């Protein structure tokens, strides 16, 4: 009754200290990611900064492919998220082998949240100190069209969709900027270029350094091309120049 915060047991206030501490491991590395969705595509931008000039910049990345049509971004303890990515991939593969169809993004997010909740109820397991952001396209009924989808999974196992979201260091400022921009325009009616400009502007305003192209990596899913792929640096450069006006 003295510790009550080293293992997954309730505090007298009805809170889990080991899960709140895993939320601080997300913002500990100092990295930030912003995910947005336009009328026909979904983009995610993650800080990719390499202070060590002897480090191969293209070896380390926070963007992962879960399935050809579902991409992921991990924010927090870098190895931990990697582990979750593996789990996600397995949760895809088994699903593909069980039902014969590719796993929906919402179902994958729900199952990943179920996996996280287990580590918050079993004593010996440590929660993964990362926030997972899955982006993809969802096949709609009664019309057959695809719609962009963002789903975040917390270390507590909380799963939720988003029109736009931010995660990491100074995520509150990015969310405030996105909410302020949302009061005027309608994000679900914008184009890919406008959504990318808004996301990069929010990322810059959260940190206030006017990032370059080598300092960020962007992943993308589109309705025309449902596959998840990373935006080339030239398009990111032109987006940044468009933002700089």
């Amino acid at each position: 009754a003295g510790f009550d915060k080293y293992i997954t047991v309730f505090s007298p206030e009805g809170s889990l200290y080991q899960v709140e501490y895993a939320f601080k491991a997300v913002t500990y590395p100092g990295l930030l990611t912003v995910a947005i969705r336009c009328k026909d595509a979904v983009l995610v931008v993650t800080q990719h900064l390499i202070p060590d000039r002897l480090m191969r910049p293209d070896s380390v990345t926070a963007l992962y492919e879960v399935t050809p049509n579902i991409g992921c971004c991990m924010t927090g303890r870098a190895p931990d998220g990697r582990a979750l990515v593996q789990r996600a991939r397995e949760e895809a593969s088994d699903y593909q082998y069980r039902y014969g169809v590719e796993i929906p993004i919402a179902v994958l997010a729900k199952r990943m949240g179920d996996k996280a909740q287990v580590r918050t109820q079993q004593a010996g397991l440590r929660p993964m100190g990362v926030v997972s952001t899955f982006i993809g396209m969802d096949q709609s009924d009664q019309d057959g069209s695809l719609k962009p989808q963002i789903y975040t999974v917390d270390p507590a196992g909380w799963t939720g969709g988003h029109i736009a979201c931010a995660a990491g260091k100074k995520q509150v400022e990015a969310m405030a900027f996105l909410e302020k921009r949302q009061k005027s325009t309608e994000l679900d009616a914008l184009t890919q270029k406008e959504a990318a400009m808004i996301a990069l502007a929010a990322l810059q305003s959260a940190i206030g350094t006017a990032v370059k192209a080598k300092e960020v990596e962007v992943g993308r899913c589109t309705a025309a091309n449902p596959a998840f792929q990373r935006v080339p640096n030239s398009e990111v450069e032109e987006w940044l120049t468009a933002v700089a006006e």
Binding site: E65, V66, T67, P68, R89, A92, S93, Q96, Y97
Partner: protein, 229 residues
């Protein structure tokens, strides 16, 4: 069942018949025995339909995850090894003959044969199924290595037609797929447009003289096709 795969300079051509038969009745006459493993790798299946379908689905699931894990493409040798292992561990419980053919940027076009025993042989061309027994001497006489893509497709279709013209367990549509560095291209030609069949062959038009009319001579003068004559 007639399946085959032939390698040309660019890639491979996979050809198959379309007939699933329960001994002597045609359960399916529009089967698709060219099963996709990856984008550029396919397999021709002969034998038990359920066993081959399960094997192909399991191998395709294994290969799809492997691409995501390594972040690159898969060589044809990897798929051949997967089938060889899975067929060798189950050789006593399944009836399957597999041809694994495809294109990879490293080794170009590759063709592998995995017979019922469970071995794996890398070949320029491979044949399989009940109708393959009719094609070996067809390949020894009429097949020349080094054909073009269109020539290879035409030869594969002609070989499949010749195979199911004589095999009762084979027939129906002819399905071909070409796998190379370009986009894979499929083709399905029907029986009424097949490159060969004995019904249209002019040398089998004249019927054998079996129903002799009652005659006063030993001279053979054709079949009796009328009551009066």
């Amino acid at each position: 069942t007639t399946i085959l795969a032939v390698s040309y300079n660019g890639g491979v051509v996979l050809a198959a018949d379309s007939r699933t038969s329960s001994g002597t009745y045609v359960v399916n006459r529009a089967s698709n025995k060219l099963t996709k493993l990856t984008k550029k790798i396919y397999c021709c299946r002969s034998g038990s339909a359920a066993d081959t379908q399960a094997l192909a689905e399991r191998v395709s699931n294994y290969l799809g995850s492997y691409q995501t894990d390594i972040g690159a493409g898969v060589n044809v040798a990897t798929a051949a090894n997967l089938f060889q292992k899975m067929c060798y561990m189950n050789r006593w419980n399944i009836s399957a003959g597999i041809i694994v053919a495809g294109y990879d940027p490293i080794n170009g076009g590759s063709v592998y044969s995995i017979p019922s025993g469970g071995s794996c042989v890398k070949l320029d061309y491979a044949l399989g199924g009940s109708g393959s027994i009719f094609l070996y001497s067809f390949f020894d006489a009429n097949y020349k290595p080094g054909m073009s893509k269109s020539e290879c497709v035409a030869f594969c279709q002609r070989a499949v037609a010749h195979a199911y013209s004589r095999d009762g367990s084979s027939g129906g549509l002819i399905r071909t797929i070409t796998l190379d560095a370009d986009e894979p291209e499929d083709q399905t030609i029907p029986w009424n447009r097949s490159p060969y069949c004995m019904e249209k062959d002019p040398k089998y038009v004249t019927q054998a003289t079996q129903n002799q009319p009652f005659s006063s001579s030993a001279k053979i003068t054709g079949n009796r096709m009328s009551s009066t004559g």
